[model samples]
Target: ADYDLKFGMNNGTSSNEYKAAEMFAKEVKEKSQGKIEISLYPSSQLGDDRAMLKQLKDGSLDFTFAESARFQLFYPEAAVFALPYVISNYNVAQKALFDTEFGKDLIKKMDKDLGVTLLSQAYNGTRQTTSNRAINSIADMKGLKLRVPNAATNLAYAKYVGASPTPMAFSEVYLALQTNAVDGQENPLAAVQAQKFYEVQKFLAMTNHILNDQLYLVSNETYKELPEDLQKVVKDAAENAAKYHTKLFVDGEKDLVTFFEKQGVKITHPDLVPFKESMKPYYAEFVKQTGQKGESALKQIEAINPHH
Candidate 1:
């Protein structure tokens, strides 16, 4: 095979995003025979996610998988999926994102508005706050210096909850936390443990604010460039990748708390009700930012929180 496409991601080589990219690569190669070659690059060697997004849209890159929340910078509607407590677990995140009618509609809108095809969005995991101090309630979050991704959803959530949110790249978080540049950061337990953030942070507060969504987006230009059969190949490969990534995530969640406990991180189960209630007022603000579809898309997920 000469070269059919290129795929990029920011996750570590061992992460599910990387594994799923491998899965997509393998499936594409098999299904397309020796005609298509999908090169996989992880660890953001092509540049950080934000950079890769540009390459993807500007025709320098073929495909990439990235955190959906970050898409909120360009398309705030992506934040609807990042809203707190709307999705209870990983499986629900899967259905609410890829299998439902609302999910399809959102797909079309992103395509029309953003000029990219959403191949699939896999469940990354539930996001929690990893900090140097305990945050057992909303009050504890006051004046907390929380490091967030450079995304609208993260900023919104951190602020609406009373934390002083600072948006920075994940690459900078560990050093920031180690030196007290920031008091804390938030991510799924997998991310916290994967990056050894537990070594620097004393508290693992289960804010469970976001059912993290990572999207696989292909440029419309690339889609139109491919033959119809190859388009099917790309779409089916994405569906395959989504399933593989999701199952890997679900299987790994069985002992995350235990894993962190063994590492000496005090895991505090926060009173989620207040934390959840605090975000209600932010919805109107979100809709105003993302428009009516964002409003309706969120309500659809809430109506079926266990959506499956």
Candidate 2:
């Protein structure tokens, strides 16, 4: 092989992310006719998302997957992708990224300013709240101690809904739930299962507050250096892998509730109307902070028909 490359991610080998990544690598190699060989580095062997992103910028890493909301680390307006209740489903999330002005700008900014090219996007999952107690309504969220990732959008999700948000690393979440260090944590159902949070958490609330989409990102240094044919091969493989990735999450969401039930975890679908209504102030604050750009992004996303 003339080109040896690497893909890094925080998700371990057991994750759908890794499976899709492996598919992408295999396709790239075959399509490139052995010109490109890619290796996997899962479980944060390279580093956390932030560290891996920095590596991409510096050309030390070739590929990595990240949620659009994760861009809030460098671009605050990007948080619009993750504001609780804003994105209704994966369809809306996809349109928000490819069919909106904000989305196009974000893609360009990533290439020009962030030194990365977004190859494709896949549905991660809709985040739900899991707790030791049942959340029957918006009222139940009040004063609940919620463990959130150390991200601004997630923190805001907890605070606006009246939960006491505790920012913690993903690795510590399971132990925290087991010891009652925190009352609950929010993530995709697959994560609750993969991390085995179900063993300690007794209730799963379908808060449906956030929809996560993972991007297949390649460093510009790596992409720009590839021959035109090889670049096409990489992009096509990423797109193919994205479809498979979304299928995994979609199928999992359909089946996981039953799996959790047999595991003794109770599930509740809290009425989301009140949950969404509670975010008015949060939305207003986002517009205030991001100004017209944020407002435009929010309006564009709202115009998308989630059910269509």
Candidate 3:
């Protein structure tokens, strides 16, 4: 049977994720010799990433790419990537940490535990604070209503650092900021540009607080049903997409920083030490709740020695 994979992206066609989806679609088309096709629905046309993940789980959808932290809803162990200051530079983050045995092992465990196949893991760049008001230190985050993904770690981290975490959908963030419903949010530079948040956000703090990652996933049932040759094609396409997306993120960041500066977004580099120290208790609770495997996961992450 022919398979037409439905790939979902949270952002509009102009987004980096959507562009990566297009690249994957092209590669799958070329590699599968028409046996498999990937149809992309950008801008949450189908639904948000979590919604898409649910559809994939029930075998109604084929694939989707979302921040790996979202998977923590099911496997708390997966939230290690979202931990504050858990990654160094992008090159080391991608090559030494994400593409290594420790990373692959985590992915494999997730697949086994959740009945989902993690095809490839890629970085979404570093997340920094953007707001209408300047945030010079961790104390400035107090009473600052910040938009965060609807996940435990995100909320916990925000509360840990004295910010009020307002959970909202990704698409709603720009308007939320515009209306002052949220004073600020955290995202990659590319995302800040893509969503034009800088227009409303007067301050851009380079907290480099957390490194975000995207996980390309397929339902195990859907993957197992694919013809053997098509499976190889899909895997190969995923790998190619990962590499391409990594380069795109790196290049886009370089350009977007300048774009932010020119847009009158006051970019400030703050000391991350206090911010990192603030998250320590949160990390301790996370591990305590998640158990030995969670402790091991934290160790695996520490082994990478991400810079503060």
Candidate 4:
């Protein structure tokens, strides 16, 4: 190959993110006809998302995956993407990222300020709850010590829903669950299966509190260095790879309940209306902190009907 590049991510090799990224590399290799080859570094080998993003900016890394919510670290208004119970489904998440004014501006900022170019976006998964005690309703969440990633939005999800949020790293969740150190945790169904949380947790609740979308991002410097034809190849490959990525998640979400059922994990569907209602104050707080830009983004997203 005439050009070699690196794509790094926090997900392990077993994750759908890695599978899609691998597909992306193969496509890019074929499309570019041996002129370009991309090497993948998974499991934070190149560091976490934050460090990888910095490497992208420095041109030390060529590509990586990120969530829209991760942008909140740099642009606070971006937090709206992850606020609990706001985004209804994957379709809504996609539209909110590319169709809305707020999303468009945020993408531009990523190019100009963050030094990263957006390639494509895919459905990651919608977060759910897995616990020792069954969550039949909002009343069941009171005082529950829920393990959450050290993210403000996740903490808010726990706090607003009447659970005590215990911030923890992903690596510790399984052991924590086994030890009963935390009553439960929230994650996408795919992750629940991937991490084998079902083994330690007894109940899987359809909280559907957060919709996560993964972004295929390239370093702007690396992208610009490519000739127009190779750039097109990379972009097209990313789009195709993203479609596969979404399919993996959609299929997993469809089939995982049965998988968990066989594992003796009881699944429950708690009415989400009360869950949505609980976030009122949190929404107001977001609007207050982010001001009109945040409010405008929220309105734009809300105005997008998820029914289609």
Q: Which candidate has the highest lDDT of all?
A: 4
Least well predicted 10-residue stretch by lDDT in candidate 4 = 42-51
Highest-scoring model, TM-score: 2
lDDT of 1 by residue, 1-308 (tens): 74568887777775777888988989889888767888887767888888887887787788987765565666557676677766677667667766667777666766776667888878788888988898888898999999998777788789989999999877788899999889999998777766789889999998889888778889887888888998899899998898888777777677788888888888888898888888888877877877876877777776665734
Candidate 1 regions exceeding 4 Å error are 67-70, 90-102, 287-294, 305-307
Using lDDT as the yardstick, the better of models 3 and 4 is 4
Q: lDDT of candidate 3 vs native?
A: 0.81
Instruction: Report the CA-based lDDT of candidate 2 relative to the real structure.
Output: 0.92
Q: What is the lDDT of residue 171 in candidate 3?
A: 88
Listed in order, each prediction's TM-score against the native is 0.88, 0.96, 0.91, 0.95
Error of 4 at 173 (Å): 2.4
TM-score, ranked from best to worst:
2, 4, 3, 1
Q: Go through the candidates in order and give each one's C-alpha lDDT.
A: 0.80, 0.92, 0.81, 0.93
Candidate 2, residue 213: Cα displacement in angstroms equals: 0.8
TM-score of 2: 0.96
Please provide, for model 2 over 61-106, each residue's C-alpha lDDT reduced to its tens digit, 9 standing for 90 to 100. 9999999889978778889889997888999989999999889989
lDDT of 2 at 254: 99
